[PDB]
């Protein structure tokens, strides 16, 4: 019907990327607007490495979640 | 083929337009007619041809 696009409006860190990959300014503005999401992961990278180090450790226990409830 | 332009005859904006081939405005204190030197081949002396 009528156009509805733009940067000031209809744009937020929550929505997903659009088709306008070719625009260099768009992707740079995309990451810059979502800076706190990157910062939250970055400063807590130590915790993620420890969890990822035992990624398969938590997968095996996931296979018997209901069975462990029987003991409790 | 080298161009020599006196300093202060053109402002920053007008100098670029002249270099880009567009119309420009100049300070009246300096006439571009005697300025904007366009070096060319010096005239050969007649003595060399005679010799």
């Amino acid at each position: 019907t009528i156009p509805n696009e733009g940067y000031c409006c209809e744009t937020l860190n929550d929505p997903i990327v659009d088709k306008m990959i070719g625009n260099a300014y768009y992707v740079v503005k995309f990451v810059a607007l979502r800076m706190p999401f990157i910062k939250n992961v970055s400063d807590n990278m130590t915790q993620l490495l420890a969890i990822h180090n035992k990624l398969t450790e938590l997968s095996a226990i996931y296979t018997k979640l209901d069975e462990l409830q029987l003991i409790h | 083929g080298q161009r020599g332009m006196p300093k202060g005859m053109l402002d920053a904006l007008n100098s670029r337009r002249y270099r880009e081939g567009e119309d420009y405005e100049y300070n009246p204190t300096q006439n571009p007619a005697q300025m904007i030197i366009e070096h060319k081949f010096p005239e050969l002396p007649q003595s060399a041809l005679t010799m």
Binding site: - | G8, D11, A12, L13, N14, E22, D23, E25
Partner: protein, 236 residues
């Protein structure tokens, strides 16, 4: 872009620091002499807007039958007009700032149809005329004809009164010129030979600053455009 209050503080801590027109702490000007600065300030801004084409503004005029002269006055605008005096205003400023009555010189006129109306062309039958600099004359008002006027606009008049205009919008490179001109009027009004010599220096300094701006073209006063007469004359 600063309010009128900063101008008094800048003058008090600036060129007019030595004179007694400032307070004891040199922080403000006396209330008894504030209008004196305002008169000089209004005069100084008019001179700058005349030499330089800094501000360009446009207005919308609606033609009314039976009227051939359309003065560009504030009382004929849709805002700040008296409904009892004028029944239907013909100047529209429904959005943005109100019409400040700052017309100096008319540049071009375009109608609602999108064409250009010739101005002050005596040999053109359909050309407009300006019997007065701030008065626009139309010799054939139509039913729905609307005209847009582009003109060189001066700064709106400043006033310290309530609900007045108290904001200054000039390029920052012209601030020394404003101070020099105001100081020139103050010192030359003392009728003192010592102050008269000082007043002359400030006037020369004001002129020196203005010519410096023109020399380096800091206001982008010059204007050039792609030549269109080449195709019009059929050179091809």
């Amino acid at each position: 872009m600063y309010y009128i209050e900063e101008l008094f503080c800048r003058l008090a801590n600036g060129v007019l620091n030595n004179t007694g027109i400032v307070t004891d702490d040199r922080g403000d000007i006396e209330d008894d002499s504030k209008p004196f600065i305002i008169v000089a300030a209004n005069e100084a801004l008019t001179r700058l807007h005349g030499r330089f084409n800094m501000r360009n503004n446009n207005v919308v005029v609606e033609m009314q039958e039976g009227r051939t002269n359309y003065p560009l006055l504030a009382k004929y605008a849709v805002q700040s007009y008296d409904p009892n005096e004028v029944k239907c205003p013909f100047i529209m400023d429904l959005a943005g700032e109100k019409f400040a009555e700052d017309v100096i010189r008319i540049l071009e006129v375009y109608d609602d149809k999108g064409r250009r109306r010739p101005l002050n062309d005596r040999n053109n039958p359909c050309s407009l005329f300006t019997p007065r600099p701030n008065v626009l004359q139309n010799n054939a008002p139509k039913a729905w004809e609307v005209l847009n006027v582009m003109y060189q606009a001066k700064h709106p008049k400043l006033s310290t009164a309530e609900d007045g205009y108290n904001e200054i919008d000039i390029p920052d490179t012209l601030d020394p010129a404003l101070d020099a001109y105001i100081a020139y009027r103050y010192y030359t009004s003392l009728n003192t030979p010592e102050s008269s010599a000082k007043a002359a220096e400030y006037l020369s300094f004001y002129d020196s600053i203005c010519r410096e701006v023109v020399e380096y073209d800091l206001t982008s006063d010059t204007e050039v455009d792609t030549n269109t007469l080449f195709r019009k004359r059929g050179w091809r």
